[PDB]
Amino acid sequence: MKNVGFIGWRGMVGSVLMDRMSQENDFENLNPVFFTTSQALKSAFDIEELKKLDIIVTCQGGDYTNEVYPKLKATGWDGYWVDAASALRMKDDAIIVLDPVNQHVISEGLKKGIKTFVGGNCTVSLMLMAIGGLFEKDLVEWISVATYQAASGAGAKNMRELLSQMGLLEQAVSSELKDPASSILDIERKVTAKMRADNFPTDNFGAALGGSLIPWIDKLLPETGQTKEEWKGYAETNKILGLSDNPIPVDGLCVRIGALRCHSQAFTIKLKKDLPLEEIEQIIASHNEWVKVIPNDKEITLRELTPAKVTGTLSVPVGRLRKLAMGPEYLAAFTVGDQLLWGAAEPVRRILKQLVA
Template sequence: MPSSQHSGKATNISQQSSRCSLKRGKVQVDARGAACPPLQGSALAYTLIGLGSGNKGCVLNKRVGFVGWRGMVGSVLMERMQAEDDFVLISEPVFFSTSQAGELGPDVGRGRAPLRDAMALDALAEMDVILSCQGGDYTKSIHPRLRTAGWQGYWIDAASALRMEPEATIVLDPVNRPLIDAALAAGKRDFIGGNCTVSLMLMAIGGLFKAEVVEWVSSMTYQAASGAGAKHMRELLAQMGVLHAAAAPLLADPSSAILEIDRRVTEALRGPALPTEHFGAPLAGSLIPWIDVALPNGQSREEWKGQAETNKILGISEHLIPVDGVCARVGAMRCHSQGLTIKLKRDLEIDEIVSLIQAANDWVQVVPNDRAETLRALSPAAVTGSLTVAVGRLRKMNLGSQYLCAFTVGDQLLWGAAEPLRRMLRILLET
């Protein structure tokens, strides 16, 4: 299996581009004959042995600092790293905190060590890699000071603060693995996760971009509460509870009039009891057709990211592919959906389109364009919590034979946030 599509399992590492295999126990040597020390403090000492000239040495000798690991994206990242045995490849995982330095950190197979201070530049500068899910304000405060102080380590970040910087690479392996490899070869050190809807769109229809058959895309998004944050997810559920409570007595009475139920729900939607502190408006039983700040051209910043980040992820700096649409927040918990209108450069048969999409990566799932399959597999309820990115409703439009309709669903916390970061770290550990 190519490295751009590896499962991430440590037991499968010998199949990857690093050409390494796992051993336990005594000290082994890498392809250059250098010693690979057992993991310090681990009950089982794992080492890597190079199996060929492709290995650049013992990949265990990296100190990786984690910041923001307790937040929503950080927690999903930790779960994925443990599920894929990523911590086996790290000589010393170091956990930082902005508020609880000195307290015991998590146990990822080495016991619990005290948390380091996430604001201490000297402690951060000891790391070979820093992976931050702490947010944009933290990045803006710490990253430039570290670089100014001469730190030459790798910075991996979930926040958007550095995405469009010239020296930063937006990461979405497997979609842009060649671009990531080229950035590493060029000495780039900042690797940033992309916007969630952009990443999920490219995971869904990346095969069409790779085949260079896309002229433009219009994306109408249906974005989950998780994209706004954990407090917003809680508020959505609280709003649902208020609406249910308003109509509960009538719901229990089969003879009650549905218009009276609707009236009570509408009153609750507009009433003072509905919590809107975080969203600023009702979301349960409604939607919010605006995400992020306004730009002078009438777009929201979320809508602007569609074209800007898509082209940067694909390495396109001239003759940009236009991407635009309307971004809306809906009452889903953690899956983003998108209705896509795609203008193709040439007329392609649906079977060819399906083949291009399916061949792009191991996680995209084409859902047949029929009602039963759509209800079964093309919804947040079907996809949430999984790495599957579903794409369906594929059909030609009445606009013309080069106009394609599609609908995609993907987990915002996985491929939309944590998984590209995990895979970027894995690339560094295997390089």
Template sequence: MKTVGFIGWRGMVGSVLIKRMIKKKDFDNINAIFFSTSQYGETINHFSIKNKFLTLENAYDFKKLYELDIILTCQGSEYTNKVYFKLRQMGWKGYWIDAASNLRTLKESLIVLDPINLKDIKQKLNLGIKTFVGCNCTVSLMLMAIGSLFKNNLIDWIFISTYQAASGAGSKFMKELILQMGYISQNISSFINNSSINIIDIERQISKYMNDPYFPKKNFHVPLINSLIPWIDKKIKNTNQTKEEWKGQFETNKILNTKKIIPIDGTCVRIPTLRSHSQSFTIKLNKNLSVNNVNNIILNSNKWVKIIPNNFDDTINYLTPSSVSGKLNIHVGRIKKLNIDKNCFSIFSVGDQLLWGASEPLRRMLKLLI
């Protein structure tokens, strides 16, 4: 039985992963050791594995890490940078599975999303590759939604507008959005129930509270509630792109192993939802396909894709972050040919970025190894 170390399991991606692994009884087939960078020595008492409460190990104990067959980390780039290279230099030959972005660019790593690249994963395993990294969340969700258009070589280019939930930035950020909701709600509840106060006056009051010095915005720097932030991650040097936007083209082409780069660009936007990312794709196809053709190609790509009919009721009920949160389903809708060009389509998609966008590809990679 393989010994697997879990690092970053307390975070959002990690806790979604562990819940799903418990549900799917994945722990029956492994010897699991749980680590923490901050709480080692403590015992986990809110869940048990094989009827045992586990004591946390130090995530920087290289001797302990060296003994593991597999390390699965959802801790973040900083941890990966501090541990991965040193462990490999020490001669550790185990498998490293990671949710963070920094190893995705390495030659020795493979980006994993098995409904898209299972064949490649198996080939690379046979070749002795031992470092497997999940995609960026929006890239995973895009490939789960419209990967079949890529696989059928139908795409000339894509422009993407994203609508990304607060949880995509980490647990501190999600908590801050909830605090922002509470701050506004507490302060305006008396106005809302007073019918003599004009709604525009209430809107002015909200703006005032958003700008007061006690408004919780330590992590986002600005209010996200009642607003949005059209900037995610740092700026890429000598370009006008953010890193989140840059990943779209790089990671998609790496995972698809494209001979000729498919141009992909976009604008990534943080919006005040808690969970699940939405994306609007403008796609130039290299063929004049009908809407029905495109629907069928997408529908037949994997069992999680659900086509949402292009009408008001279905769209407002099923093409929303809340309709997919906590589920593996990827909803794809508003599929339409654009007036501007017979080969151009626009498509809207939503998916849970903590599941297919982060933890599920890692869980499935671990299952392949064990």
């Protein structure tokens, strides 16, 4: 059996991985070695210890990767590096994994001798898992996106801050709310007042999230005006599909909203050919076993297409499908997916399963 070392397995992403791996009994087929950065298991900074492993799975982070990775491969280490961090995604000797979408790219890479595999951007993979079928048929000319991103994508503390913010907003009018005859505008003035108060906790987002939203995620790229988050749309979608030569335009705005762990996305998809809505749906639905097409019905949409429904599950619903007024080659679509699963730990867990097979 393969000797696999794990780093950052105690973090939030790492913990989801450990849990999913237990659930699927992945540990039965490999020999796990756990590392730590603490000086209170092996040291994550001991290159010789890591050098003995066949595979390394890290959820530790980019700083860790940029530090340890170059050293280890510099020793001649011929093993596999499976990383969740973005650090290596855009390396020539690396491949971005999303096997239900790009297995063919993964296989060929393994044969080509690639030894570094990295999970991709959460919003990008959640998009591909949803509308992968369209890409598989080369039916996508371009795609405009508007995202509704969860706090988990920013971190555990960001999630807690969001929750604290929600608490304080309500507390500011807890009694008024109980009084069924109370004034709505007065309640409103008070909650907005607290949202704006000096003691309203916004250290992590740099702005209120609960009761609001933030149309900016990550650093700005002066070159295009996009934020790194929005940039990853074009860059990562194509590297995953292996189309850096004939790049499919993917762009839009990435916005943070008060959700815990599911990212939702509104798509304006330009199809290369006018096809009947029903044929589009069938194509969408048959690409993989997780995507789920939700009928353009109100009650079903309210029960299925929301963070409330998909949180903590591997289901990737896509609905509100219809043609847009701009023309029969313009498709509207809305999807919801869990950020910590297909958006983080799952792709990692699945490339590992293949490597130890």
